[PDB]
Ligand binder design. Structure first.
Ligand code: HEC
Ligand code: HEC
Ligand SMILES: O=S([O-])[O-]
Length: 227
C-alpha cells in the first residue's frame, strides 16, 4: 500500500481545473442543496465520507477518496461486469442518497471526478491507499438490538435523535444526519449491511467491537426508503 496524503488547497492550480475541483468539493459536501434533482434524501456524500478542514473523503477507514481514481475500472458483482468510477458514483446517488444517477457526462459529475483526482494526486495507478474503504466488523454472534438500543440512547441519541432523524443546522443542512426514516439512506445502500455499519461506527467514533456490533444492529432494525 501507499500512505494517505491530503494535498494542500493553497497549491490548487489557477484555471478551469482548479475551479472544477472547488465545485466538486461543494457537490460532495452539500449535495442535497446543490443537486436537488438527483438527491432523494437528506444526505450529502460527506456524511459517510468525512474529511477535515472542509475537504471530503480524506479520513482513513471512512472510505476516503484519496487514491480512488486509480482503482477504477473494477469488477462489480452487483453489475456482473466492470464499472467505471462514474458508474460507482451513480450507484451512490441511487442508494445512499436515495436519488437518481447523474448522466455520465454531467458537468457536476465531472467536477466530482476532478476533485477525487486532485485528492489522488501522486498515488500510483493500481496502488492501494492505507485506510481505503470501510473495514467490515463481523462478530461470531447475532447482534443484540436490545443492548444496541441502550447503547444508542447512551452514546448516539444526543446527536442523531430519539427517532434517528438527526439534527438540522441553521442553513437546513444536516449537522447530524438521519440514521433511519424517510431522509436516511435506502435499503440498497452499503451502509444497510450489518458488518459495514458496524465497521463504520467502530472506526468513526471509544466503542468496543461488541458495542459497535450491537448498536449497528439496533440502527438497522428501523424502516428506511425501499430501493
Ligand atoms: C452512507 C449512507 C454513504 C453515503 C451518503 C455515500 N456513500 Fe459512498 N460509500 C459508502 C460505503 C459504505 C462504501 C463502501 C466502502 C468500501 O469499503 O468499499 C462507499 C463507497 C464509495 C466509493 C468507492 C470507494 C472505493 O472504492 O474505495 C465512491 C467513489 C463513493 N462511495 C462515492 C460517494 C459519493 C460521490 C457520494 C455522494 C453522492 C457517496 N459516496 C455517498 C457509504 C456512503
Ligand atoms: C455527535 C457528536 C455525534 C455522535 C455522538 C454520533 N454521531 Fe454518528 N455522525 C455524526 C456526524 C456529524 C456524521 C456525519 C459524518 C461525519 O463524521 O462528519 C455522523 C455519521 C454517522 C453515520 C453515517 C451517516 C448516516 O447514516 O446518516 C452513522 C451510521 C452514524 N453516524 C451512527 C452513529 C452511531 C451508531 C452513534 C452512537 C455510537 C453515533 N453515530 C454517534 C455525529 C455523531
Ligand atoms: O453504492 S452504495 O450506496 O450501495
Amino acid at each position: 500500500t501507499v500512505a494517505l496524503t491530503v494535498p494542500a488547497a493553497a497549491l490548487l492550480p489557477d484555471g478551469a481545473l482548479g475551479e472544477s475541483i472547488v465545485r466538486g468539493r461543494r457537490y460532495l459536501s452539500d449535495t442535497p442543496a446543490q443537486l436537488p434533482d438527483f438527491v432523494g434524501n437528506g444526505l450529502a456524500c460527506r456524511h459517510c465520507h468525512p474529511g477535515r478542514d472542509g475537504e471530503v473523503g480524506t479520513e482513513a477507514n471512512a472510505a476516503p477518496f484519496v487514491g480512488v481514481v486509480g482503482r477504477f475500472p473494477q469488477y462489480s458483482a452487483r453489475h456482473g461486469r466492470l464499472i467505471t468510477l462514474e458508474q460507482r458514483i451513480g450507484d451512490c446517488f441511487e442508494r445512499s442518497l436515495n436519488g437518481r444517477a447523474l448522466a455520465l457526462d454531467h458537468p457536476a459529475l465531472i467536477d466530482m471526478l476532478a476533485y477525487m483526482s486532485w485528492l489522488s494526486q501522486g498515488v500510483p495507478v493500481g496502488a492501494v491507499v492505507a485506510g481505503h474503504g470501510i473495514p467490515t466488523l463481523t462478530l461470531e454472534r447475532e447482534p443484540d438490538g436490545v443492548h444496541g438500543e441502550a447503547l444508542y440512547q447512551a452514546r448516539c441519541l444526543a446527536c442523531h435523535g430519539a427517532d434517528g432523524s438527526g439534527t438540522l443546522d441553521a442553513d437546513g443542512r444536516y449537522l447530524f444526519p438521519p440514521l433511519w426514516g424517510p431522509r436516511s439512506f435506502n435499503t440498497g445502500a452499503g451502509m444497510n449491511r450489518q458488518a459495514t455499519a458496524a465497521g463504520f461506527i467502530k472506526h468513526k467514533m471509544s466503542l468496543s467491537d461488541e458495542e459497535a456490533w450491537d448498536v449497528a444492529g439496533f440502527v438497522l432494525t428501523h424502516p428506511r426508503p425501499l430501493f
